Amino acid sequence: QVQLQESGGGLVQPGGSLRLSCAASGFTLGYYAIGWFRRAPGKEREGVSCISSSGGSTNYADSVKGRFTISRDNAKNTVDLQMNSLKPEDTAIYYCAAEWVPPGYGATVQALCNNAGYGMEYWGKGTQVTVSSAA
Amino acid sequence: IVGGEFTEVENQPWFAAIYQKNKGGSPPSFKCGGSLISPCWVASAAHCFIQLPKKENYVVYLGQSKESSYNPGEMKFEVEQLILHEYYREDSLAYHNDIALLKIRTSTGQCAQPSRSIQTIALPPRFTDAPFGSDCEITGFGKESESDYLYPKNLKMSVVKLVSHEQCMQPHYYGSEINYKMLCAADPEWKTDSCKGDSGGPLICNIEGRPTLSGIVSWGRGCAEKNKPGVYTRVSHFLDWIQSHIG
Ligand SMILES: NC(=[NH2+])c1ccc(N)cc1
């Protein structure tokens, strides 16, 4: 009965901003590192941005540095992704995924993010972000 | 693991953390240590799995280190085969045939790929063991004291010395509850030793100047208790068994 659910998808003007949210039910999201991953039309799934369970460590794809901001609220059981200065290239399905990082590793969530998300335990159904002049 | 150092990215790269799954989205619980003897095979202790011998209950982690970045794609493994020795039995204090094999794969069906942080460990030649008095090293996340309840956060390693059966089978040691399919090891100063939660983990000896899995942490009365060594499953007497379940 474990569920991850993304929300915030939609259609925004290039240069505009958009906020995504990942909510959990059936478990405590706060024990888990969370990644936001996206699949664009034609390309393969890529790590957008990641955050550790306590929130101390983050990772950003070079594509989104300074534009995207990941955060979380372990009281409210959520993780957020703030997307500013959106570009057409950001158009994709955005997924939220959750993975428990065992003790005995580095503090970093860098490898958690650069590897297209293979092995991440839990996944949301995904939500659509489209950036176009059609907005 | 009482009285040692903390390990690093190229120390004990064969070490495997074996976790038991909890129901729901509860994080799993650390259950035992283990050794990567083949890219697809981890050796551990049977007594670790006897309560829940179904493979679905476990997940294996590799490449643990404070300087290693966790990658679930390469470092997390499901267990596609769980093999316990068929004549595993529990005695008053000792385990018999305390050995198990776990066949592991990643989420994409791959085996362990070698790296700075993940290596296999060599099995011994048949019926060959280092001489008694050799320095072997032990490794784990187990208690750092017999009395301590807290488990440590990061991987420890220490050095013990092999103890002869004749010395080990003395009454004020373990008497007749030691057989030759076991290996005893201790600190001559009785200050360092493996402990609760090191079970299934490696005993690494040199054989021909080659690091070798000579033992599997199996049991002991207390931890680092004077006159009381750690008892290990003697891998050299189980090779036929191991290579009958693999190949
Ligand atoms: N080395 C020991 N005294 C020992 C090893 C394993 C174990 N389960 C308990 C004690």
Side-chain angles (χ1 to χ4, degrees):
Chain A
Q1 192 236 295
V2 162
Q3 330 170 291
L4 277 180
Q5 322 168 261
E6 305 93 343
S7 57
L11 178 60
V12 67
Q13 203 170 328
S17 72
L18 201 58
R19 191 184 196 91
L20 298 183
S21 181
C22 184
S25 38
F27 71 119
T28 294
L29 198 58
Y31 295 120
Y32 287 80
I34 267 66
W36 286 95
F37 304 84
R38 70 189 175 184
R39 191 169 2 237
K43 297 187 180 178
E44 153 66 336
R45 211 173 51 197
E46 66 170 329
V48 175
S49 180
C50 313
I51 189 171
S52 58
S53 63
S54 72
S57 309
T58 52
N59 186 83
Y60 292 97
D62 299 319
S63 332
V64 304
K65 288 180 183 297
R67 294 164 46 230
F68 288 8
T69 294
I70 193 174
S71 72
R72 63 193 301 163
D73 190 332
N74 291 347
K76 290 174 171 292
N77 220 36
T78 55
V79 175
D80 280 20
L81 179 60
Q82 180 65 52
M83 298 171 175
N84 298 325
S85 310
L86 282 166
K87 305 177 183 179
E89 63 180 60
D90 296 320
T91 289
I93 308 182
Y94 285 73
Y95 310 92
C96 155
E99 172 73 9
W100 181 72
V101 183
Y105 291 97
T108 187
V109 286
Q110 192 160 38
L112 202 84
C113 215
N114 297 342
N115 279 271
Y118 292 119
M120 299 283 288
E121 183 88 344
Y122 297 115
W123 289 88
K125 272 264 222 176
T127 193
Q128 180 69 34
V129 175
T130 298
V131 196
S132 181
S133 63
Chain B
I1 187 78
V2 312
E5 316 181 355
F6 296 102
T7 87
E8 296 160 15
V9 62
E10 307 100 356
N11 294 134
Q12 311 284 337
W14 38 79
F15 183 76
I18 310 188
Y19 283 77
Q20 179 168 322
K21 290 177 177 184
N22 294 306
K23 298 174 181 178
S26 299
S29 306
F30 180 81
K31 189 67 179 177
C32 271
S35 309
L36 193 75
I37 61 175
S38 171
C40 309
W41 292 90
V42 164
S44 189
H47 81 256
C48 296
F49 305 94
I50 177 61
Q51 298 179 272
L52 291 174
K54 299 259 193 63
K55 56 177 178 289
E56 289 78 14
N57 287 115
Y58 306 95
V59 40
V60 180
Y61 298 97
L62 302 184
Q64 259 154 327
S65 148
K66 291 177 182 180
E67 296 298 318
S68 57
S69 316
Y70 176 63
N71 170 12
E74 292 175 356
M75 301 183 182
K76 181 169 69 172
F77 298 78
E78 304 300 325
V79 176
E80 65 166 311
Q81 264 205 97
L82 176 58
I83 302 172
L84 284 65
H85 205 287
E86 41 271 353
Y87 297 107
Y88 164 84
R89 303 295 256 101
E90 297 192 359
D91 203 294
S92 309
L93 172 58
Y95 300 113
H96 289 267
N97 301 310
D98 199 26
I99 187 174
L101 301 168
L102 283 71
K103 195 181 184 180
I104 60 174
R105 62 181 176 184
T106 71
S107 60
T108 63
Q110 291 180 112
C111 288
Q113 306 269 327
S115 66
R116 277 171 201 176
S117 51
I118 303 183
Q119 292 295 327
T120 53
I121 178 65
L123 299 175
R126 331 180 93 217
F127 304 111
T128 314
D129 293 274
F132 297 120
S134 303
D135 287 348
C136 312
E137 43 198 27
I138 52 181
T139 307
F141 286 106
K143 316 213 224 185
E144 327 187 41
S145 190
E146 191 188 347
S147 23
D148 277 351
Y149 311 127
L150 305 197
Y151 290 83
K153 203 203 279 224
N154 282 231
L155 194 58
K156 301 218 310 172
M157 71 184 158
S158 191
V159 172
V160 291
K161 279 175 156 58
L162 284 185
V163 177
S164 63
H165 296 87
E166 157 162 32
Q167 174 142 278
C168 204
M169 294 175 312
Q170 259 154 18
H172 63 294
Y173 273 65
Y174 285 132
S176 63
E177 255 208 297
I178 294 287
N179 65 41
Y180 288 105
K181 296 158 69 172
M182 307 176 189
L183 248 181
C184 286
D187 191 33
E189 289 272 286
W190 303 105
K191 106 171 181 57
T192 194
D193 189 14
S194 61
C195 201
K196 203 211 189 69
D198 293 322
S199 290
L203 177 71
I204 308 292
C205 295
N206 266 25
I207 304 192
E208 303 300 69
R210 181 90 169 182
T212 289
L213 179 62
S214 288
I216 295 169
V217 177
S218 184
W219 57 280
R221 185 150 24 187
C223 306
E225 227 170 75
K226 80 108 67 178
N227 287 356
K228 250 72 167 174
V231 193
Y232 303 77
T233 313
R234 191 174 174 190
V235 176
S236 72
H237 294 339
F238 286 94
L239 289 175
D240 276 330
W241 185 79
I242 293 181
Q243 301 271 2
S244 93
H245 289 267
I246 323 152

